[PDB]
Amino acid sequence: GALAFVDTSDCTVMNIAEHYMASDVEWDPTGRYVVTSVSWWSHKVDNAYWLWTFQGRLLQKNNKDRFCQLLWRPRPPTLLSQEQIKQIKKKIFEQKDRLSQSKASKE
Amino acid sequence: QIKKKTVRERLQIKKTELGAKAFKDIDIEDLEELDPDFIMAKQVEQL
């Protein structure tokens, strides 16, 4: 396994996530995770589950024996509009979500 | 003359060139600090 992320505007080769057990790579129907995971009857026991996040942060830690795949259980047809993406086309209003997470991570 | 011959065979000018090359490498690394912040900022503004 040799992973790399190909970003856009500009095209770069910036990161490498290490995977020794993985066989297949498929991404989520939101845009949230692209996972590289392992198969039992096609290779040896080297087992891990390491999914790829974009920022270099860890997306999975799991070793559960003879696992074959992990992929998105899908969602409905969304029937979205361009007006909601235009508001996300505006820290400016997206300031609350980190601070609410900080109160939940307090000890 | 021997010191001039030794400097010419090896090549203050070489030390200044090495310092300029090190400064250029350091300038690229500082831009990487802005970019790795910005790529993390690209993750943060998306999420």
Curated annotation (Swiss-Prot), chain A:
Q: Where are the WD repeats?
A: 11-53
Q: Where in the cell is it found?
A: Cytoplasm; Cytoplasm, Stress granule
Q: Which superkingdom heads the taxonomic lineage of this protein's source?
A: Eukaryota
Report the PTM annotation: Phosphorylated. Phosphorylation is enhanced upon serum stimulation.
What does the UniProt entry state concerning the protein's domains? Answer: The RRM domain mediates interaction with EIF3J.
What family is it from?
Belongs to the eIF-3 subunit B family.
Subunit relationships = Component of the eukaryotic translation initiation factor 3 (eIF-3) complex, which is composed of 13 subunits: EIF3A, EIF3B, EIF3C, EIF3D, EIF3E, EIF3F, EIF3G, EIF3H, EIF3I, EIF3J, EIF3K, EIF3L and EIF3M. The eIF-3 complex appears to include 3 stable modules: module A is composed of EIF3A, EIF3B, EIF3G and EIF3I; module B is composed of EIF3F, EIF3H, and EIF3M; and module C is composed of EIF3C, EIF3D, EIF3E, EIF3K and EIF3L. EIF3C of module C binds EIF3B of module A and EIF3H of module B, thereby linking the three modules. EIF3J is a labile subunit that binds to the eIF-3 complex via EIF3B.
Role, per record = RNA-binding component of the eukaryotic translation initiation factor 3 (eIF-3) complex, which is required for several steps in the initiation of protein synthesis. The eIF-3 complex associates with the 40S ribosome and facilitates the recruitment of eIF-1, eIF-1A, eIF-2:GTP:methionyl-tRNAi and eIF-5 to form the 43S pre-initiation complex (43S PIC). The eIF-3 complex stimulates mRNA recruitment to the 43S PIC and scanning of the mRNA for AUG recognition.
What name does UniProt use for this protein? Eukaryotic translation initiation factor 3 subunit B
**Encoding gene per record:** EIF3B
Q: Covered range within the whole protein? A: 633 to 745 of 814
Curated annotation (Swiss-Prot), chain B:
* Job of this protein: RNA-binding component of the eukaryotic translation initiation factor 3 (eIF-3) complex, which is required for several steps in the initiation of protein synthesis. The eIF-3 complex associates with the 40S ribosome and facilitates the recruitment of eIF-1, eIF-1A, eIF-2:GTP:methionyl-tRNAi and eIF-5 to form the 43S pre-initiation complex (43S PIC). The eIF-3 complex stimulates mRNA recruitment to the 43S PIC and scanning of the mRNA for AUG recognition. (Microbial infection) Essential for the initiation of translation on type-1 viral ribosomal entry sites (IRESs), like for HCV, PV, EV71 or BEV translation.
**Which lineage?**
Eukaryota, Metazoa, Chordata, Craniata, Vertebrata
Q: Where in the cell is it found?
A: Cytoplasm
Q: Which domain of life is it from?
A: Eukaryota
What fragment of the full-length protein is this?
Answer: 630 to 677 of 1382
Give the quaternary structure.
Answer: Interacts with EIF4G1. Component of the eukaryotic translation initiation factor 3 (eIF-3) complex, which is composed of 13 subunits: EIF3A, EIF3B, EIF3C, EIF3D, EIF3E, EIF3F, EIF3G, EIF3H, EIF3I, EIF3J, EIF3K, EIF3L and EIF3M. The eIF-3 complex appears to include 3 stable modules: module A is composed of EIF3A, EIF3B, EIF3G and EIF3I; module B is composed of EIF3F, EIF3H, and EIF3M; and module C is composed of EIF3C, EIF3D, EIF3E, EIF3L and EIF3K. EIF3C of module C binds EIF3B of module A and EIF3H of module B, thereby linking the three modules.
Q: What is this protein called?
A: Eukaryotic translation initiation factor 3 subunit A
The entry's comment on post-translational modification says: Phosphorylated. Phosphorylation is enhanced upon serum stimulation.
Source organism per UniProt: Homo sapiens (Human)
**Family in the record:** Belongs to the eIF-3 subunit A family.
Q: Name the gene.
A: EIF3A
